């Protein structure tokens, strides 16, 4: 049972988008799909409802006349129309099964989520990140342990993706929560804690990526 | 409209219950209601927590422990998310839903819980220099990163040469880790002539009356 969104991003005010999520590993046909709502610090908002069939919807007042919730069974998609853009709609938008059952006749609640698409709303231009090595002072490398970094800077539409070493590195890695700077565009960092002694065994490369520019960088980090 | 309300945070012992309330408007009654709870943890998207009707009519999501339960007051016109045996597992937001012809879905605001008890942890502090690739491009930021420490309240400070900085500093607030600890971030911007004009630079983390320095030299 797999709910797999796609389709987020950056759009100006007014401007379009289309979500999809495309669902796996049971009867698309059968089940209710909600799309669900959560601004940045914010709680969950339900945004729209499609029945089984697709022939009857439902959407919240905030967005009554803007989306269009639709279903295509014969391909297991579900998709989010979102015409008519405002700031409000800025957010994390996912997608929901609602149960099947046939007073607690129908309880109908959410079963399983999406991962979540962050949609931005924004007259700002996208702009891709430059990635920085962040090697250290050369005194830790003759301690037990040494921190390696890459540094991830001035990339206006969230979010980014970092990796270490195309996955095969995880034991040991901070990623830190982007900072918005003044400049309107953010800036993140990640660090992986090492052993001294591999830093003589394996390389490291950090695995930078940022769709809405189609930025993808893999960093070597060298000491 | 009807209205779910859930207070914004709340915090409870260690080893003891938890009651999460969820007051609906006076538009509904609890007694007839279908209560959802989801359970979101930073990172991740919301789960299905616990179905509660009535004591013969629960339902707890997969993977969720048998602590957990419901419970209502209807001269409150209040549901409730019962969770003994507290662990520092079960720091979440905990979120209640109901369905309304009018308005069919229906969220609660959620609920932060906080679990007491948790030790406090000093911040660990790392202190780059700017890049060398940086610096070719005329630019040099200054990064602090911030880990591990408990409770979630620091404050930075940058000196150049011990002086104070005030221009190009950008903070982050903390942020929750897998572990419940919290993170920060802190930023320097400055030109590659400010920076080779000072001896060194140094980050300034202050915990609870307590502080950490970390430094770095051109
Ligand atoms: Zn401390
Ligand atoms: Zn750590
Ligand atoms: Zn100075």
């Known amino acids: 049972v797999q709910l797999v969104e796609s389709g987020g991003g950056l759009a100006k005010p007014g401007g379009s988008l289309r979500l999809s999520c495309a669902a796996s590993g049971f009867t698309f046909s059968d089940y209710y799909m909600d799309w669900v709502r959560q601004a940045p610090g914010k709680g969950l908002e339900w945004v729209s409802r499609?029945?089984?069939?697709?022939?009857?919807?439902w959407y919240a007042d905030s967005v009554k006349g803007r989306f269009t919730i639709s279903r295509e069974n014969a391909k297991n998609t579900l998709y989010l129309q979102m015409n008519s853009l405002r700031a409000e709609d800025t957010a994390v938008y996912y997608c929901?099964?609602?149960?099947?059952?046939?007073?607690?006749?129908?309880?109908?609640?959410?079963?399983?989520w999406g991962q979540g698409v962050l949609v931005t709303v924004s007259s700002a231009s996208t702009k891709g990140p430059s990635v920085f090595p962040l090697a250290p002072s050369s005194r830790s490398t003759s301690e037990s342990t040494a921190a390696l970094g890459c540094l991830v800077k001035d990339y206006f539409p969230e979010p980014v993706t970092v990796s270490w070493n195309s996955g095969s590195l995880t034991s040991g890695v901070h990623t830190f929560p982007a900072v918005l700077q003044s400049s309107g565009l953010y800036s993140l960092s990640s660090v992986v804690t090492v052993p001294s002694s591999s830093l003589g065994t394996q390389t490291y490369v950090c695995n930078v990526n940022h769709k809405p520019s189609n930025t993808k960088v893999d960093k070597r980090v060298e000491i | 409209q009807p209205v779910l309300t859930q207070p914004p945070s709340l915090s409870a012992s260690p080893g003891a219950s938890a009651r999460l309330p969820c007051t609906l408007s006076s538009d509904l009654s609890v007694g007839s209601k279908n209560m959802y709870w989801y359970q979101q943890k930073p990172g991740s998207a919301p789960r299905l927590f616990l179905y509660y009707y009535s004591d013969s009519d629960k339902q707890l999501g997969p993977g969720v422990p048998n602590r957990v339960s419901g419970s209502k007051e209807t001269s409150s016109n209040t549901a409730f998310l019962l969770i003994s045996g507290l662990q520092p597992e079960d720091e979440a937001d905990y979120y209640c839903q109901v369905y309304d012809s009018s308005a069919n879905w229906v969220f609660g605001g959620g609920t932060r819980l906080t679990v007491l008890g948790q030790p406090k942890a000093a911040p660990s502090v790392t202190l780059f220099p700017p890049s060398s690739e940086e610096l070719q491009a005329n630019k040099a930021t200054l990064v602090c990163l911030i880990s591990d420490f408990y409770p979630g309240a620091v404050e930075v400070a940058w000196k150049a040469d011990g002086s104070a900085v005030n221009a190009g500093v950008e903070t982050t607030k903390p942020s929750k880790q897998s572990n419940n600890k919290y993170a920060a971030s802190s930023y320097l911007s400055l030109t590659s002539d400010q920076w080779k004009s000072h001896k060194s630079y140094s980050c300034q983390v202050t915990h609870e009356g307590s502080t950490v320095e970390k430094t770095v030299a051109p």
């Open positions: 929901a099964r609602e149960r099947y059952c046939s007073c607690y006749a129908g309880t109908k609640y959410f079963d399983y």
């Open positions: 499609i029945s089984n069939g697709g022939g009857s919807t």
